[PDB]
Design a protein around this ligand. Structure first.
Ligand code: GDP
Ligand code: GDP
Ligand code: GDP
Ligand code: CL
Ligand code: CL
Ligand code: CL
Lengths: 388, 388
């Protein structure tokens, strides 16, 4: 498992600003993220901005301290020292895990004088940084990662994920039965002869790690409630991980028929960014729909692991381009000539040609759907990329 | 009578969006937003203060062409600087351009939660009195706003007064000439005309401030979209402003002459998916250039105005409500007994009962549609509200 860094600090000290630096959809909207994959640094890691949970600290914030591999305590170096900061430092100092004191917004400053007050916190060396502009952030992260040192399974290895109370335990018990669940990290089992592995592990950190360890994620939704922010950030994390995905709309036994289309329409409207995944309507309690859930889990694994021959891809591309030409880039007419796979799990298709530098999102969506149909890629977040 | 516009100006990271959110904060928070997403706003209606006004956070442009325009066209500028940091060379160049302004320019020394020391450093900018504030916590903000507004001193038209709004280059000028030159149309900021006996007024490069002023002067807005491009962020924020104004709306999907038949459904799909929050308005698919489809615009403008101005008797509303609830009960089981109109242009329906504190967004959607069908309210952003 790769490390998780939890950002902690007073409101307005620069946490989300830092988080966006470390981890850097429809028009007019911006997707809320308070946890994601660290992209700044030589090693992979997860980042949690505990500002997204919230004076004393918050229940989930203290949990993040217990569960993260390290905490960054962010403070406003321009201000001076607020008494709220001294309280937080008192709890963090007890951490048996790393606590890095980051003195933020110290850009163009004197890094020694700006960390003068903060030795009193007894959390060690203050790290003068600037989350906005990046001064010292890369070097801070590299020291955090100097602690932790840095092949696809032949069958689907899946994690059941989702909000509390959607039915994950009921689904797992329905899948495994009593006898194989009493032998619980990885539980290998067989179904109709074919092999599967389920991963057993609210804890954001625990959910990210389930996603990291799996090659398929089964996202469980409670059909009896509206889709929630937390439903959406979990699914969003899975999407950023490129994890193959199957969606289990659970507690379907509760919905009357009149309400059924209203709920299917509601769910596709609010989880549009999952239209690459098959949606099953199941009842973990009454054990209905589980068989087709397994068909889709296997299909998601297959799609995720596909190896597509360049001539097939190029053939599919040229037929699509012949039927509908790409949008004219103002005056210039893009030419799409060939394409090949540049990644796996998820598959990535790289399109080659001239003037591919401003291809509209809708045309990229048309190529994606064509490729998905041609290669049966439902279940994996296939991505198109233009060689520019 | 035009309302004043205040433009926030300043370096990245001085507190503009924070201030803008404070100044435009709606207690009820009425935006039809999705789970996990947040709708971006950098201009809106001012809510802090005794008088009405608009606010623009010029940070949403990234000096810059549009920012310089806001300096020219706003009634006043707030120049936001970081009092904690000190005085950056970038701040001084901005002061050099702002100092030439023939309109009010207020120097706000932010993040002060030391007022005397922070006013001496900033007198070097020669922008007058520094105002020490804290946009995050609110220190001094209210007094700043009242001092800006102490300059500007503080009936529905019987027929539709409509404004054509939308992004640069979508066809607004072509559409206006087409409307005034149509077959059945007979002909200092308002242009009065008539069609088939009924009266109309249309309101007469691109300016965010001018778009906001068009909406406030109107009782109906015609939003023009360029069908030949993907819906853009700027398409959505213009529509979003119209929505926050509660402005009755007709949507003109323009340049339909360019779209081939195959591409046409892929485009209607794309538009309804990305402008979901406009599902209350009729969409027309027109060609302003070839002057096709303009005739049907006039009925929808009339229909939207009529809907916006409706007066619904309490017994009819309660009747429709009790019937809707009888056919589909709410999902402890809330009881909805009666309802009345508590607002106009847009109409607002207030529902009274027990256990109404957690009604799902999806049920409120069922009631909104039910009321919309029953009272012919397409074109006005009708909203349901619960008394707790
Ligand atoms: N009607 C219905 N209720 C269910 C179903 N699955 C779970 N529940 C109920 O949801 C509650 C929580 O289920 P649980 O498996 O613990 O959810 P978890 O938090 O995701 O593990 C329990 O009281 C279940 O009986 C289902 O398929 N249908
Ligand atoms: N000067 C400076 N300003 C910053 C920095 N990071 C964030 N800000 C500004 O701080 C304001 C709010 O900070 P935010 O990131 O939301 O703090 P959070 O509440 O901890 O997430 C924004 O207007 C930011 O642009 C920094 O490193 N330097
Ligand atoms: N093909 C096509 N082009 C149009 C149409 N309406 C406007 N245009 C073109 O769009 C460009 C800008 O139009 P204009 O009315 O100035 O857009 P505005 O910025 O919204 O006022 C011009 O070159 C027009 O010829 C239409 O219905 N079809
Ligand atoms: Cl991962
Ligand atoms: Cl293949
Ligand atoms: Cl205030």
């Amino acid at each position: 498992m790769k490390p998780t860094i939890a950002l902690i600090g007073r409101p307005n000290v620069g946490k989300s600003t830092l988080f966006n630096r470390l981890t850097r959809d429809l028009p007019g909207l911006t997707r809320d993220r308070h946890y994601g994959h660290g992209k700044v640094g030589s090693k992979p890691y997860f980042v949690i901005d505990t500002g997204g949970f919230e004076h004393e600290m918050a229940k989930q914030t203290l949990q993040a301290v217990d569960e993260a591999d390290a905490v960054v305590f962010l403070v406003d170096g321009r201000t001076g020292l607020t008494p709220q900061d001294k309280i937080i430092a008192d709890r963090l100092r007890q951490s048996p895990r790393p606590v890095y004191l980051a003195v933020n917004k110290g850009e163009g400053g004197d890094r020694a004088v700006l960390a003068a007050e903060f030795y009193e916190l007894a959390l060690g060396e203050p790290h003068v940084i600037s989350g906005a502009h990046g001064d010292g952030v890369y070097y801070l992260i590299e020291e955090i990662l100097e602690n932790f040192p840095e092949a696809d399974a032949k069958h689907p290895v899946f994690a059941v994920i989702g909000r509390p109370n959607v039915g994950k335990s009921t689904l797992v018990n329905a899948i495994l039965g009593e006898k194989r669940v009493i032998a619980f990290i990885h539980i290998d089992f067989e179904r109709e002869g074919k092999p599967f592995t389920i991963i057993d592990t609210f804890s954001v950190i625990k959910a990210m790690q389930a996603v990291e360890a799996a090659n398929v994620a089964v996202l469980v939704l409670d059909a009896q409630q509206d889709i929630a922010d937390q439903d959406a950030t979990i699914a969003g994390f899975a999407l950023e991980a490129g994890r193959a995905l199957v969606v289990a709309v659970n507690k379907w036994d509760g919905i009357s028929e009149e309400r059924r289309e209203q709920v299917k329409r509601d769910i596709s409207r609010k989880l549009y960014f999952l239209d690459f995944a098959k949606f099953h309507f199941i009842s973990a309690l009454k054990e209905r729909g589980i068989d087709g859930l397994f068909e889709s889990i296997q299909a998601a694994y297959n799609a995720a692991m596909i190896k597509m021959p360049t001539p097939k891809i190029t053939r599919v591309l040229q037929t699509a381009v012949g039927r509908q030409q790409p949008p004219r880039a103002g005056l210039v007419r893009p030419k799409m000539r060939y394409a090949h796979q540049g990644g796996m799990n998820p598959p990535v298709i790289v399109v080659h040609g001239n003037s591919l530098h401003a291809i509209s999102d809708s045309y990229t969506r048309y190529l994606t759907q064509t490729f998905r149909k041609a290669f049966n890629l439902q279940g994996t977040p296939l991505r198109i990329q233009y060689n520019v």
